[PDB]
Design a protein around this ligand. Structure first.
Ligand SMILES: Nc1ncnc2c1ncn2[C@@H]1O[C@H](COP(=O)(O)OP(=O)(O)OP(=O)(O)O)[C@@H](O)[C@H]1O
Ligand SMILES: Nc1ncnc2c1ncn2[C@@H]1O[C@H](COP(=O)(O)OP(=O)(O)OP(=O)(O)O)[C@@H](O)[C@H]1O
Ligand SMILES: *C(=O)CCCC[C@@H]1SC[C@@H]2NC(=O)N[C@@H]21
Ligand SMILES: [Mg+2]
Ligand SMILES: [Mg+2]
Lengths: 70, 592, 482
């Protein structure tokens, strides 16, 4: 076991109060849910809108890397 | 003449204590400090402060020339030495007197005579003090030690005539040990103290340590202000002390109160002092020592007897007779707990570190004498003691109850302390006792106490789950105040964030070289394992050495650590000399 | 029967003091706090803590239902009220007893009897205590007040029979003022305390306030733990106090010691309490009051007599007989200095503010009882007292010397405090005294003292859950990110 658990550092709640606390915290916990994936869509990416000199090193380190990085 | 400005030739808690006594007396006060102490409370609390310079005791508080120069420049007219350093240096006492300053202490002759153990034995025998069966003079040879031990039985303690700090003794359980022990004793007494003289006495198996506070004036009056019991000792150094001494018959108690006065009168002693005794399991008292200084433990006597002992020192050094004509009657009971910067989870070894938090207990029956505060730093150069907690009550039971409270309130953070030990022992049946005796003794902490203190780790993340960020919030449920620690990744209900892309958790590696499965690499460098002072160099360049051979002794926190050759070879680059300050990882030498 | 868990129905310094006593006694302790105190030291020091809610004493610590609800929810079996608030409310004491809790205090009837200064005067007379000349019954009109002031001479005090806090007393210096003062006092007593009953007595010109600490047994034993002097006062409220009371003759230490026993024993009193007296410049003692609670000043008596008075309260409420069999001998001398947030440079006017630094003195002879620490915020909702510095020595002179030290060390920053006043008075010849008398008196601060002090220079979310049969409000920080 190496999950980081909730800790009650001070106080000793009765089981009813532990249940109220955990129910409220679990209702507050929200948003991401399961780890869905944002699908890759490079259409109209900002790096493609920039002017690069024909010999710009940013063609390698910015443009190409942005397209290739996965 | 009369004291008007006191220079406090010390540091830390005792310097604060004496500065406070001087303000109460209306005297001006001068602090002196080494460079590590440039921000210490006493430096800020005194009416003046003078920088001795230097980083270590040998080049600051031990230098006569510097302390007398600080007194001259400040125009101080008295010196109070505190305890340690020069407080028992008879030649410093003489130099202070020769400078025309008021020495707040016993005469140089009294210091010299009571500091010599065998002269002290003669003084106590002349005073008809209770002595443990033992040799009246230094023993000459292991054969004489064997003859003594054959007469008196076993075990026998062989002791250096000038030793201190618990290193002054060895004990022989079986006769055959005597020659090796005597060799070790004469060797190490020459090495540490410059004197080879050894004497032998009966070793007491489970003794209590009991001591009488004396106040003696220059007019020959003596008052015994009370007794302490100081049996909770570690490495023969005291950790918990209490007053009055509990569980003594009135016959024992009066014999202590009388022999202490006879001993002081025979010694010609004046000033504050203390007569130390041992009490055997048989109940026999035996004279042990006279300490020619104010004791560290003095405040439990102050709290029980109602006397300000530092101001009594000022009065005596003014040459006034004692206004106290009779031994005070103790009221209540008091404990002192030394707050040493020592980790009880590693055999009470001291370590330097930052005092990132210091919250003293307060309220009924609590007194705090501290030399540190939040933001202080403990370097490796001086004794580990941060502070003293004194807890007083109407009875030993009420003082224990208050001690359990106060020690639960006491918070120190950023370095290890013995507070977890004090929390244990004030709740341990061996020290609570049965109401007529108790089981603690001068070796109980090492050999009897159930040490369950977990080693100090501070805030370091050690396990995988420790690496996760956390938030602490206060929730009220039905009115109950709860403090709730929430992981920064809690996947409860719809919660998430268990991993941003590519985030991995694993057990962090300790900030130490290599794996713990080996001591060191095959490299040739001997490197210092800690900050400290090179106290001894045991080798010379071109010396051939073998693994385990001593290379240097490093003193840190006033404890010696031997640094030893990790391989065989030739010492090829000895880079340090005795007295050199040294940092962790410094190359001392290469072995080739 | 016996105390097992104590709820401390108070705040600040006294809440800390009682929590500490409970910890010493091995009892469990329950704190309660109003929202301004949600991080006060006592809330963290107690074994349990309950929010009362509310922003003021009347919304919180004074609400019987909130205190008894916290006791019910925490499972406390005793209540200790401290001082102030409900500590002398006989109806609350009764409500506690009816709730079946151990009330750590005197009986509701003893409270109600001694809280009426008229019935108190009767009990004192029947106990044959010294009494100042005065009417045995409330005065009906200014003409009765004038007749009294003619027959016994001016000045005369017109005093409310109910309430106090220093506002309950007005002084008529000459007969022409009496009608206005009488009517004004009547209307003000109606407004402030709901009852207009007032009485008249001789006003002492420069008295010393002296008081006896009593511990009294449910079995009718009584002990005087010591005399105390509280004559340094402003607005008739105490600022510096000391024990034992200095410069009394033995015939005045006796008489006080015996009157206090007689008064309490005839009132049927039990618990801790104080019989307050005035001592005139003629040296005549007069009974003044009984306070039916632990005194604010009590630490100076604990230091001089060696008794833990809160633990004595616990024993008496357990109904154990007193283990102290005789009046203790005072050992040394002790002072207490109240560290109020009042600016002595502006007529001791209270000012709220942040306690941006708080460094109590330490070392020999110093005790600090504190309700605040660094980072506390002081608002106007409660009394100004931050802490009490208690200083003790073998003699009065030594305790003064130690006080000059400790008060020079005492550092407080971010609001005004009376510390500069304490620093003056401990050096002031009027208080040091000539060695057989001193010149301070209960008006010596507002007059006669040289006031050379310079002037000072998101809501929580709530969710109402239900769990089985209980409503449970869960209160969260308003920005909980979770
Ligand atoms: N004969 C003995 N038998 C048992 N223990 C002993 C004996 N002599 C000394 N000890 C132990 O040694 C401790 C301290 O010894 P001692 O007082 O002689 O040295 P010290 O404190 O280092 O002296 P100094 O004042 O010279 O620095 C005693 O508390 C006791 O624990
Ligand atoms: N007859 C009197 N002559 C002079 N001063 C008096 C007299 N009666 C009361 N005082 C002054 O009133 C204050 C104490 O009065 P009292 O005991 O009625 O106070 P209170 O407002 O009821 O407060 P508490 O009950 O909290 O002590 C002190 O300043 C005392 O000097
Ligand atoms: C050293 O840093 C200063 C003095 C503190 C150590 C001394 S040694 C002798 C006394 N006994 C003790 O335990 N501490 C004192
Ligand atoms: Mg010793
Ligand atoms: Mg009053």
């Amino acid at each position: 076991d190496h999950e980081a658990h909730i800790k009650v550092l001070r106080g000793e709640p009765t089981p009813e109060e532990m249940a109220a606390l955990m129910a409220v915290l679990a209702s507050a916990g929200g948003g991401p849910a399961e780890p869905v994936k944002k699908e890759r869509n490079m259409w109209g990416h900002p790096v493609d809108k920039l002017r690069y000199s024909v010999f710009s090193w940013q063609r390698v380190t910015l443009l190409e890397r942005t397209h290739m990085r996965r | 003449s009369k004291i008007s400005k006191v220079l406090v030739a010390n540091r830390g808690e005792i310097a604060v204590r004496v500065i406070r006594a001087a303000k109460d007396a209306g005297l001006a006060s001068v602090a002196v400090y080494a460079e590590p102490d440039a921000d210490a409370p006493h430096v800020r609390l005194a009416d003046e402060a003078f920088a001795l310079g230097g980083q270590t005791s040998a080049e600051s508080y031990l230098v006569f020339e510097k302390i007398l120069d600080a007194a001259e420049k400040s125009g101080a007219n008295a010196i109070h030495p505190g305890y340690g350093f020069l407080s028992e240096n008879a030649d410093f006492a003489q130099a202070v007197i020769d400078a025309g300053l008021i020495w707040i202490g016993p005469s140089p002759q009294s210091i010299r005579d009571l500091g010599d153990k065998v002269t002290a034995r003669h003084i106590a025998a002349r005073a008809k003090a209770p002595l443990v069966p033992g040799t009246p003079d230094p023993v000459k040879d292991a054969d004489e030690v064997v003859a003594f031990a054959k007469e008196h039985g076993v075990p026998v303690a062989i002791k250096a005539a000038f030793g201190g700090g618990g290193r002054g003794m060895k004990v022989a359980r079986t006769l055959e040990e005597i020659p090796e022990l005597f060799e070790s004793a004469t060797r190490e007494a020459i090495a540490a103290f410059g004197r080879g003289e050894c004497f032998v006495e009966r070793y007491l198996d489970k003794p209590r340590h009991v001591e009488a506070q004396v106040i003696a004036d220059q007019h020959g009056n003596v008052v015994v202000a009370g007794t302490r019991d100081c049996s909770l000792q570690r490495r023969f150094q005291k950790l918990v002390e209490e007053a009055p001494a509990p569980f003594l018959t009135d016959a024992q108690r009066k014999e202590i109160h009388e022999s202490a006065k006879r001993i002081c009168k025979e010694a010609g002693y004046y000033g504050a002092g203390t007569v130390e005794y041992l009490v055997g399991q048989d109940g026999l008292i035996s004279f042990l020592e006279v300490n020619t200084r104010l004791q560290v433990e003095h405040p439990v006597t102050e709290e029980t007897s109602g006397i300000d002992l530092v101001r009594q020192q000022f009065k005596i050094a003014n040459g006034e007779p004692l206004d106290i004509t009779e031994d005070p009657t103790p009221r209540g009971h008091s404990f002192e707990f030394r707050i040493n910067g020592e980790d009880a989870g590693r055999g009470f070894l001291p370590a330097p570190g930052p005092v990132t938090k210091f919250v003293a207990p307060t309220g009924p029956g609590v007194r705090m004498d501290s030399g540190v505060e939040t933001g202080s730093v403990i370097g490796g150069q001086f004794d580990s003691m941060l502070a003293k907690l004194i807890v007083t009550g109407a009875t030993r039971e009420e003082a224990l109850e208050r001690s359990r409270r106060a020690l639960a309130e006491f918070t120190v953070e950023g370095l290890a302390t013995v507070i977890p030990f004090h929390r244990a022992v004030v709740s341990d049946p061996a020290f609570i006792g049965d109401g007529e005796k108790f089981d603690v003794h001068t070796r109980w902490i090492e050999t009897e106490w159930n040490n369950t203190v977990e080693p100090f780790t501070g805030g370091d993340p050690i396990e995988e789950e420790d690496t996760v960020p956390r938030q602490t919030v206060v929730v009220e449920v039905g009115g109950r105040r709860l403090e709730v620690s929430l992981p920064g990744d809690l996947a409860i209900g719809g919660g998430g964030g268990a991993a941003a892309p590519g985030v991995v958790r694993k057990k962090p590696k300790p900030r130490k070289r290599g794996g713990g499965g080996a001591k060191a690499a095959s490299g040739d460098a001997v490197t210092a394992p800690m900050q400290g002072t090179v106290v001894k160099v045991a080798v010379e360049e071109g010396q051939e050495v073998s693994a385990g051979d001593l290379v240097v002794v490093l003193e840190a926190m006033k404890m010696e650590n031997p640094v030893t050759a990790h391989k065989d070879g030739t010492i090829t680059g000895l880079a340090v000399e005795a007295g050199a300050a040294i940092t962790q990882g410094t190359v001392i030498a290469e072995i080739k």
